Design a protein around this ligand. Sequence first.
Ligand SMILES: CC(=O)N(c1ccc(-c2cnn(C)c2)cc1)[C@H]1CC[C@H](Nc2ncc3ccccc3n2)CC1
Ligand SMILES: [Mg+2]
Ligand SMILES: [Mg+2]
Lengths: 238, 293
Amino acid sequence: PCWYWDKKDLAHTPSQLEGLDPATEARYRREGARFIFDVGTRLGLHYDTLATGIIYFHRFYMFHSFKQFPRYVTGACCLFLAGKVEETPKKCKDIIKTARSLLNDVQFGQFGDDPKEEVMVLERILLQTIKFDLQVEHPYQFLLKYAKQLKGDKNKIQKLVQMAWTFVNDSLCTTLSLQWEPEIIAVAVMYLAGRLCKFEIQEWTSKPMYRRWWEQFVQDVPVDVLEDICHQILDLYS
Amino acid sequence: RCVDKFDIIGIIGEGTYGQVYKAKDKDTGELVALKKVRLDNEKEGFPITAIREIKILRQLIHRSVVNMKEIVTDKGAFYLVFEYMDHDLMGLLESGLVHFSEDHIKSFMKQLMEGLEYCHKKNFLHRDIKCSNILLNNSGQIKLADFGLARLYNSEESRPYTNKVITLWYRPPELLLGEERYTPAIDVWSCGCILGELFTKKPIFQANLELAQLELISRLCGSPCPAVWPDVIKLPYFNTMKPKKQYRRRLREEFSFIPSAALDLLDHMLTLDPSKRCTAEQTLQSDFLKDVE
Ligand SMILES: CC(=O)N(c1ccc(-c2cnn(C)c2)cc1)[C@H]1CC[C@H](Nc2ncc3ccccc3n2)CC1
Ligand SMILES: [Mg+2]
Ligand SMILES: [Mg+2]
C-alpha cells in the first residue's frame, strides 16, 4: 500500500466531510499523538514503539473521523498494537491504568463502562484500516545512521543529532509522516539543526565541496521540500 | 475484503489459533487455503504470535516459501489467505503406497534448501521444520510453511533465544542439551531428518522424551563428546543428560542402502557440532544437489 499524501489531499479527511474544522482536527491530532507519547513514556516503552503507535493513529484518521472514534481510546489502541508489533508488549490493563493516570474524569469518559473492551473492539478495526501493513520505520534510525557517517568535531555532531532528535519527536504531532518517508524527515531535521546551530554540514562529509550534503543519504530531495518540512516543524513553536 | 468472497469447502488442518480451510475464490475460481485466527475468547487481543507470524510472512517472497495473498475478515475472526497445495509431506509418506525416486528427492531437497537459504539470508529462523510443515502439490512443487515459531535472529553478534523449539523428532542435539545462543544450524538438522525420512518413510528419531531422543541420536550419530564437539561441555545439560554408553558414529553403515552422494549430504547435515554442520548454502553445492534442474 501507499501511505503518503499531498498536502492538498490531507485537508480532505473523514472528519472534514463530517463538519469538523481544520484547527480542531489539527488539535485533536496533536493531543492524540502527545497522549500516545505520554502513556508509552510512562510505561517505559521506547522510541520506535511510540512512533509506530503514532503512525497507526495518523493513518487511522485518514479513513475514519474523530466524531465517530474518540481520540484517546484510539491512541491507547494504537500503542497496544504497536507494543506487539515491536516486540515490547504491554498488557491492556496496564495501558488503561496509565491512560487513566494522565486523563481527567471527562477525557477518560471516552473509554466508557468497560475501558478494556472498548480498546479490544477497536483493534479489529485498526488492523483492517491499516491493511495489516504493520512494519514501519521511523526517522530516528536514519538520523543515527546518517550522522554516524559524518567525520569531524564530535561535540558539534552530537549537538546536531541531539537537536535533530527532539525535532523528530516534535514532527510526530504533525501529519509529516503521512507526507514524507522517514528517510527524508531525518535529513530535514538534520538540515534544520544545521541552520539553527549554524553548522556547515558538507564539511563533515567526504566531499566538503558539495552544498547538497544529504544526497549521499537520500537521492533526489529538493531543498524546498526540506524548507517546507522545516517550516511545519517550526510552526509548532510560534 | 470479506470471507463471504470465498466458497468454503472443508477443514484441511488445525493451526495454532484456528482451523485451516480449503476454499474457492468467487471472482477468480482459484483454490486457496484459509488460516483462521480466532479472537473472541482472547484476553490480550489479536494474538501477538499471529502478529509475529504475519510480519514475517509479509517479507517472504520466494517460490519455495509459502506466500500470503491477503488477509480477510468475518461478516469475529480473520483469515490468512494462501494459494492451495494438494498435500503436506507427512500425508504422502503415511499412506505408504508412495516411493520417492532418487530424482524426486533431488528435486524436493533443492527446493526446500533454496527455500531455507532465502529465509536464512534474510535473518529468519524457521524453528519448526517437520514433514507436516512442508507442502507439496502435484506439479512436483514444494513450499515451506508454518512460520508460527519463526523469529528474527542476529548475525552481526550472538543473542539468547527460546530453547524449547522444533518438535522433538526434528530437534537437534544442541537444543536437547539446553543451548540458547543457537544458530540457523538448527533448521538444517531438521532438514537432515527429512532427507533420512525420505529414504525410509519412517521418521528417523522417534522418542517421546528428550533423554530418550538424545539416546536415539547418539546411537546413530555418535555420543556427543568434546573430541567431536569441543564446545559441548559448555552446555547446561551436558552433565545431566547422557546417553548410556559412549557410542561410535555409525550413520553410514545404517544408511549404506542410500546413494553415495546423498549419504555424504546426510552425514554432513546430521553432524553433531553445529559449527561443523553444513549451511543451507553449502548443501546446494553438494554433489547430491549441485546440478539438479
Ligand atoms: C493429509 C494431507 O495431505 N492434508 C491434510 C492435512 C490435514 C487434514 C485435516 C483434517 N482435519 N484435521 C484436523 C486435519 C486434512 C488433509 C493436506 C495438507 C496440505 C493442505 N493444503 C494447504 N495448502 C496451503 C496452506 C497454506 C498455509 C497453511 C495450510 C495450508 N494447507 C491440503 C490438505
Ligand atoms: Mg523497526
Ligand atoms: Mg504445523
